[PDB]
Amino acid sequence: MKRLEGKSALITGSARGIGRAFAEAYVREGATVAIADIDIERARQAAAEIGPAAYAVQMDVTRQDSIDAAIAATVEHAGGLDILVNNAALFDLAPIVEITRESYEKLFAINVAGTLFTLQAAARQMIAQGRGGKIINMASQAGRRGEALVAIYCATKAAVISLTQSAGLDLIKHRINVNAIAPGVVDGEHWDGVDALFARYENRPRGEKKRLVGEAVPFGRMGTAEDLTGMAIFLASAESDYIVSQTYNVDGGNWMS
Amino acid sequence: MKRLEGKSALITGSARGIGRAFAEAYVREGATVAIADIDIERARQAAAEIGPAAYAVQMDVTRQDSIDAAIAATVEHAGGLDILVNNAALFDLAPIVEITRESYEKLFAINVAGTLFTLQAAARQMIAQGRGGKIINMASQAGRRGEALVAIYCATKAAVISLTQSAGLDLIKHRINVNAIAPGVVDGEHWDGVDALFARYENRPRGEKKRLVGEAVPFGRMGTAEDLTGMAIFLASAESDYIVSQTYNVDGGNWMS
Amino acid sequence: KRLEGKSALITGSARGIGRAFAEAYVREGATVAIADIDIERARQAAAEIGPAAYAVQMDVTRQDSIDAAIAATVEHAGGLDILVNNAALFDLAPIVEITRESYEKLFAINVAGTLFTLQAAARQMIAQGRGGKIINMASQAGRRGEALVAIYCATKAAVISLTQSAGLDLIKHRINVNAIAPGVVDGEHWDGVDALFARYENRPRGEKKRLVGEAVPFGRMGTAEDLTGMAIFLASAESDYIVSQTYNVDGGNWMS
Amino acid sequence: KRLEGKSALITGSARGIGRAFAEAYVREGATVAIADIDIERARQAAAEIGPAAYAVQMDVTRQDSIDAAIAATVEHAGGLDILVNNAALFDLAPIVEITRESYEKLFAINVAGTLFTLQAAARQMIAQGRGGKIINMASQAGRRGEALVAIYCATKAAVISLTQSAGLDLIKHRINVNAIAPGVVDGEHWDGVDALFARYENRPRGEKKRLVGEAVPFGRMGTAEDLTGMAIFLASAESDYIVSQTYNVDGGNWMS
Numbered sequence A, B: 001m002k003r004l005e006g007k008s009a010l011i012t013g014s015a016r017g018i019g020r021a022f023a024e025a026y027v028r029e030g031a032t033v034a035i036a037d038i039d040i041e042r043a044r045q046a047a048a049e050i051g052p053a054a055y056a057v058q059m060d061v062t063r064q065d066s067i068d069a070a071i072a073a074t075v076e077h078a079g080g081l082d083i084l085v086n087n088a089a090l091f092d093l094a095p096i097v098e099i100t101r102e103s104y105e106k107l108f109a110i111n112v113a114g115t116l117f118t119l120q121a122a123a124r125q126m127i128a129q130g131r132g133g134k135i136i137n138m139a140s141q142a143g144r145r146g147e148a149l150v151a152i153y154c155a156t157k158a159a160v161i162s163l164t165q166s167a168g169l170d171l172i173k174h175r176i177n178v179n180a181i182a183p184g185v186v187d188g189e190h191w192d193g194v195d196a197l198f199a200r201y202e203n204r205p206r207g208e209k210k211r212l213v214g215e216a217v218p219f220g221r222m223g224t225a226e227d228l229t230g231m232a233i234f235l236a237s238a239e240s241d242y243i244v245s246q247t248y249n250v251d252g253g254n255w256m257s
Numbered sequence C, D: 001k002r003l004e005g006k007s008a009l010i011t012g013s014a015r016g017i018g019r020a021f022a023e024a025y026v027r028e029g030a031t032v033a034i035a036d037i038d039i040e041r042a043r044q045a046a047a048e049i050g051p052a053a054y055a056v057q058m059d060v061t062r063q064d065s066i067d068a069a070i071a072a073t074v075e076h077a078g079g080l081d082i083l084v085n086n087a088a089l090f091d092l093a094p095i096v097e098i099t100r101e102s103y104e105k106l107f108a109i110n111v112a113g114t115l116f117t118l119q120a121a122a123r124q125m126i127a128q129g130r131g132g133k134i135i136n137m138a139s140q141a142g143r144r145g146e147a148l149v150a151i152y153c154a155t156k157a158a159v160i161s162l163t164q165s166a167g168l169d170l171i172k173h174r175i176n177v178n179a180i181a182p183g184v185v186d187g188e189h190w191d192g193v194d195a196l197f198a199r200y201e202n203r204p205r206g207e208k209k210r211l212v213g214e215a216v217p218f219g220r221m222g223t224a225e226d227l228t229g230m231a232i233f234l235a236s237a238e239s240d241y242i243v244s245q246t247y248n249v250d251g252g253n254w255m256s
């Protein structure tokens, strides 16, 4: 297809799961992809498995110096930055009266501050190049509507949707598209962990939550990262140039926006 | 690219404007396209200009017998129906105290009933075939939020978003995706009419509303049909198979959903 | 009290939520036209509520009936201050079994009935020059679609849209247009809802009613008395700055 | 009247909307903690409002301050029945000029402030076993993003989210969690808003205020008094079935 031919992308948290499937689909479409992760060991493996057009970048989105160095590493390696995917995220679950300041601080630091300050750094580079840009934030059904036990993670994803809108309005004058994707329930490592938290607080065998949520998807199954790669390419591609400040649910019907 | 290779499409209201641009893009992507319009003269012209893979069908979405004969024509000519685009619509504007029963009956008959009952006829054919299906309703910024002067057209597109959600949840068991596109302000014959209506009721020179509205788009310009064709292909394509009951704004940031 | 000396009309207020609203308005000092297509049931409702209530035959699907009800409100009460568009009809059916009969029946009363009654009440409130309160009945069903409930969800989605458009156009005349979206409310309406779901989801009668009442975050099926606070609030001076809103009163069933 | 014998705490209630809420709650028979980082301004507001109002020094960004403020409410009034999370901070800046300082400042007060005061009040209401009312202050800014207001929009979007999550999780304790979304409201707050826009949009001081007031469908900038109705309603028995909602009180500025 080669919809992203000769673009330079960076994907946060892309050593594994959705981010890694995005990095693989972007390379197939002709992009050069910085596989950015706090796990540089795993990012190096993913990059070697994907091919020459992927390369590994150590990044902690909670740290300005680390954000700024991955953008620099992208510029130094790929000549610049065309596509940012804000994919780095942390999940946690607790009822209101058991939420910790540590839970709040760590999920806001990566899900909100990590997304905003990486977007800022990417937009400054895209503006300095003068060629436009594509920024794709990762939201979630969790950001469409609250849940009794997931206040913190829901709020971070609600903040990401709002940030997507703000930044898209502020950056479209530079021909930077900011938009977001809102997955449903996606099978993998991520949803294994989610399931363990619900197992504890809803008093359920390990694996039952993840079975039930997958069966309640109107489409009829839990998501895969491959359900999402179409939209990831589309929102990075010329065919989305008029799309601004949107969150698109790709969730088998889990949330209707 | 040929992402709709060997597919059979029908687009209501496609002799001109957005639907004609969709029929043109679908053909480029390998589709066979029923150019359905109440205006057979213009459909025939549009099909001749697009090429052999387009073919004209006389249709009034307000009439059951016409709906069912357009679906049959599609099966007779293309062997079946894979993609419906519900594009046929009617625009009107009047303050609350000036809305006529005639404005309401005619815009609900085309924009709502035409959409629902064509969707119904296409869903039955797609179920009969057993191969799944793609249905794309045309909503509007006007369906996201009301306007003092556009209560009827706004309500119809609000009903389309709702219908899109309902039909999506009901039809996805048959592997029929129902989604919608929500354009912003799009340049052409359509918006010339809109402008004439505002000119009268906001007491403005012809062309001033079109100017102002195109200049208030955060993207920075009035839409084109070409802005939309990417989304039209995508939502008809295998890369949108997990997308269900969504309305996607392609509007240069005019409305943020 | 809070509606002292105000003239209301409620469409479809012989029975259920509409009737709870008429009674609650009369307790707050309002005169209320109990507008219903069944004049027998309206008359009973009016006798039970007391002298401040009166019965008005009305078919919100007929222009002539609309204009005659508004006129009858003017004749009896001197004018119209509050309209509640409560008249509605429920139906259910999968996409492939939806009939033009259902579509035309639910649209004529839930949408056209709301719109043209609102138009008539607007015209009257504009001519009086004293402003006004209009309250459309939306539903959780207007907030999101449902596989089986396409037609009824669409009508209530259109009511939320209309409520927005009308509130924007009419606020210059000091007329507030807003809507209430109930969730799952116990009564003769949800007896009918349950019966349809019983057929289409293969359930014993009463099970849907039970399941949805228990899924309400608050912990039960709603009552009309849950809604009276808001219907008073939105027709009162304490909501003068409130324009073009739909407010969910639904135990958390839908979060807007 | 409607809040007779209830104990309220309002964060950041020495001045503006919070202070109008305090006075309106005392008029409706409430005892009110005027909680504010500025104890001198709180003392003045308390003295002006009358004996039912008392001042509490409170930094909603500090856990110890939050807990001591809840404890001062229990000591002074005997319990806590109504929290209003009103304390908030405005800032404006384009994406490329957002500081970590702004992000950290606005989230600490607008989000963490709201969340951990809500948690502290929840714990106290649960231990009491008598239910309660929590009202978060959202904003039109919470409803949609703006080019120059990413941080403040994001905080109020998180307040809407938190309001939904908290309301769902606390309704079993008969605690209602709801929010109010003002639009553009006149006062010291919008003075500061206008000053920031004057810089970034290159406008004379006061112009932004003028433009936004005039673009409210209703026809003017809002007052605190536009909001007291709803603040009372959401703390009252006639909102007991109202759960996890954000209600716009904004003259039509934003339609939800």
Ligand SMILES: OC[C@@H](O)[C@@H](O)[C@H](O)[C@@H](O)CO
Pocket: A140, A141, A142, A147, A150, A153, A184, A185, A186, A194, A213
């Ligand atoms: O990725 C987050 C996950 O999808 C989850 O938060 C769901 O919203 C919810 O927690 C239960 O189904």
Ligand SMILES: OC[C@@H](O)[C@@H](O)[C@H](O)[C@@H](O)CO
Pocket: B140, B141, B142, B147, B150, B153, B184, B185, B186, B194, B213
């Ligand atoms: O095609 C619909 C059209 O975009 C128009 O209705 C705008 O919503 C509005 O009328 C004001 O610009």
Ligand SMILES: OC[C@@H](O)[C@@H](O)[C@H](O)[C@@H](O)CO
Pocket: C139, C140, C141, C146, C149, C152, C182, C183, C184, C185, C193, C212
């Ligand atoms: O008054 C409408 C009613 O509450 C219903 O349509 C529900 O939305 C749903 O159909 C089943 O729970």
Ligand SMILES: OC[C@@H](O)[C@@H](O)[C@H](O)[C@@H](O)CO
Pocket: D139, D140, D141, D146, D149, D152, D182, D183, D184, D185, D193, D212
């Ligand atoms: O207090 C929030 C305020 O109303 C402001 O943020 C407006 O939303 C907007 O920023 C300018 O009109």
